[PDB]
């Protein structure tokens, strides 16, 4: 009885994802595979300088790149929040819980969506107008040369699952509606929404990837993996916090990170 409604839920989520996220995975992969009829490639210091206007004061390069990643993350947080608000039931949750879910969920979604922009050799930046090589990012002085490499490692494995935007819309919704975040006041309505989202995700994967038998189980495991990526990311931010003193942190990120893990 619920299958037709689970498809309407899937469609609603896809439509909402298209409204929320300017650069989709479909569009990103067309750029990455060279099948549009343009991105400026940044692969060393000279190309970085040249490309800066296609994509801060006079801080060192590693810090300026890190600052840029911060403003992009802030924009992503806003897009993700708009998307969360279109998940049926989410705006009716206690506002404290909406904040908690985003606080602890938005980095897992950022890494998910970053994989759509990545291949094994680099990452699209500035809504697809630039492409920064993985080797270039690895060449930055420590510890900045290490920030992105776990995300690339994650992305290559995750992209091998060949999810599309419709699949990702539901996957991201499931992660946001996690009833085990610390400090949630009312877990039951969250788990009730997430159970429906999980059924919608299983049906979506069986219909859209009928040859891929245990794809649902593989995605559940990717949810666990994302939590470890975000743990490793906070650890690195601690190393930075100490060693590096030229580090302003955008207020929105300050708010998210405060008492985060």
């Amino acid at each position: 009885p619920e299958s037709a409604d689970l498809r309407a839920l899937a469609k609603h989520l896809y439509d909402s994802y298209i409204k929320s996220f300017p650069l989709t995975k479909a569009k990103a992969r067309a750029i990455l595979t060279g099948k549009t009829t343009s991105p400026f490639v940044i692969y060393d210091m000279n190309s970085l300088m040249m490309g800066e206007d296609k994509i801060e004061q006079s801080k060192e390069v590693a810090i300026r790149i890190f600052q840029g990643c911060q403003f992009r993350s802030v924009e992503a947080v806003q897009e993700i929040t708009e998307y969360a608000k279109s998940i049926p039931g989410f705006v009716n949750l206690d506002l404290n819980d909406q904040v908690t879910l985003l606080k602890y969920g938005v980095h897992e979604i950022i890494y998910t969506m970053l994989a759509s922009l990545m291949n094994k050799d680099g990452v699209l930046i500035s809504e697809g107008q630039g492409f920064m090589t993985r080797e270039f990012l690895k060449s930055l002085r420590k510890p900045f040369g290490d920030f992105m490499e776990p995300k690339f490692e994650f992305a290559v494995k995750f992209n091998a699952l060949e999810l599309d935007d419709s699949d990702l819309a539901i996957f991201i919704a499931v992660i946001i509606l996690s009833g085990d975040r610390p400090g949630l006041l009312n877990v039951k309505p969250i788990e009730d929404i997430q159970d429906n989202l999980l059924q919608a995700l299983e049906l979506q994967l069986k219909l859209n990837h009928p040859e891929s038998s245990q794809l649902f189980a593989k995605l559940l495991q990717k949810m666990t993996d994302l939590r470890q990526i975000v743990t490793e990311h906070v650890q690195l931010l601690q190393v930075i916090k100490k060693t590096e003193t030229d580090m302003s942190l955008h207020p929105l990120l300050q708010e998210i990170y405060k008492d985060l893990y």
Binding site: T81, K85, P251, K258, D259
Partner: peptide, 17 residues
């Protein structure tokens, strides 16, 4: 609410229409 009070900016984004 204690989370609400500690997250002024996330609250504003959530409230927005």
């Amino acid at each position: 609410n204690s989370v609400x009070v500690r997250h002024x900016l996330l609250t504003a984004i959530l409230x927005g229409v």
